[PDB]
Each structure stands twice: as C-alpha cells, then as structure tokens.
Amino acid sequence: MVLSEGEWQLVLHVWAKVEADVAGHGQDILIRLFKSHPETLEKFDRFKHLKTEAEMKASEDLKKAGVTVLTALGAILKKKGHHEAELKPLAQSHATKHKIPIKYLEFISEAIIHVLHSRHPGNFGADAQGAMNKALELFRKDIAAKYKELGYQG
Ligand code: HEM
C-alpha cells in the first residue's frame, strides 16, 4: 500500500504534537494497551508484576519503555514509507527474542489511535485518524512480511 503526501502530512502534523511530550504519551499508550489487553503485559518481564494503573503510572521502567516505543515508531513514520532499514532489527527482535504476535501490534495500534483521539481532538479529526490508521496498517503489513522471512509470522 501507499499513502499520499497529503496523508503523510496529516500523520506528521499530529505526531509533532505527540513529540512535545514523548514520555507522557508513551505512558498513556502503554497503560491503555495493558488495561484493554492485560495479556500483553506478560511480555514485559521487567514490570509484568504491576497490578494497578496507579502502580503503572508510578513505574519508571514502564515510562522508559513507552519512550522507546514512540521514539522508534516516530523514526519509522518520518521515513514516509521508506522504512525497510529501520524495520529489519525491529522485526528480528520482536519475532525472535520477545515473540510478539501481529495480533499484539494491532492492539497497540488501537491504543495509539485512542490516545491521540483523547489528547488531540482538534488535530485528530476523521481524515487525520484515517491517515494514521493507514500508516499503522502499512507498518503492520511490512512487519508481518518480515516476520515470515524470519521464520515466525506469528
Ligand atoms: C509500534 C510498536 C512497537 C515498537 C515500535 C517497538 C519498539 C521496541 C524497541 C525499539 C525496543 C528496544 C530494542 C528491541 O528491539 O528489543 C522494544 C523492546 C521490547 N518490545 Fe517492543 N515495540 C513495539 C511493540 C511491542 C509490543 C506490542 C510488545 C508487547 C506486547 C512489545 C514488547 C517488547 C518487549 C518485551 C521488549 C523488550 C523490553 C525490555 O527492554 O526489557 N513491543 N520494542
């Protein structure tokens, strides 16, 4: 699939807002993911023991993980589709080391959309959300293809 320049502009416009507070968006997104799909928390051995949202909000390890997720995703989005190089090591670690099914990438994609919708209603209208969804679908499609080449595709 291919996004138009206009769609990339909508994506990068709201992303510039996200970058004003990377750590805060990172926390919100991961907490949303864990509350909606608790099974996903089990993959993070470092903080798999957190029981409540209050504990999650207080965790420095979870905040750092959120910053890591957003910084990596931001680098990918700014490539505007020319992200083959950035995707290789990411697909390898998530398929082979962490063992993250595509299903979970769909779950985090939904958490990202929910948080942007909550925090940036003025810059995340229907057209902007459609463009962000398309960009994340492109990301998931290319990652799924790499998973298969690596012997996982789970
Ligand atoms: C947009 C989605 C994602 C991005 C861009 C991303 C990015 C990263 C990055 C850059 C790291 C650091 C080095 C490495 O590759 O190991 C990492 C680690 C990890 N990721 Fe992801 N990730 C994503 C989604 C997920 C999901 C959905 C899960 C689990 C449900 C997950 C679980 C992990 C785990 C377990 C680690 C290592 C934690 C640690 O450092 O101890 N990732 N991810």
Swiss-Prot record:
InterPro entries per UniProt: Globin, Globin-like_sf, Myoglobin
Major localization class: cytoplasm
E.C. designation(s): 1.7.-.-, 1.11.1.-
Keyword match Amino-acid biosynthesis: no
Function field: Monomeric heme protein which primary function is to store oxygen and facilitate its diffusion within muscle tissues. Reversibly binds oxygen through a pentacoordinated heme iron and enables its timely and efficient release as needed during periods of heightened demand. Depending on the oxidative conditions of tissues and cells, and in addition to its ability to bind oxygen, it also has a nitrite reductase activity whereby it regulates the production of bioactive nitric oxide.
Complexes and interactors: Monomeric.
Protein name in UniProt: Myoglobin
Native source organism of the sequence: Physeter macrocephalus
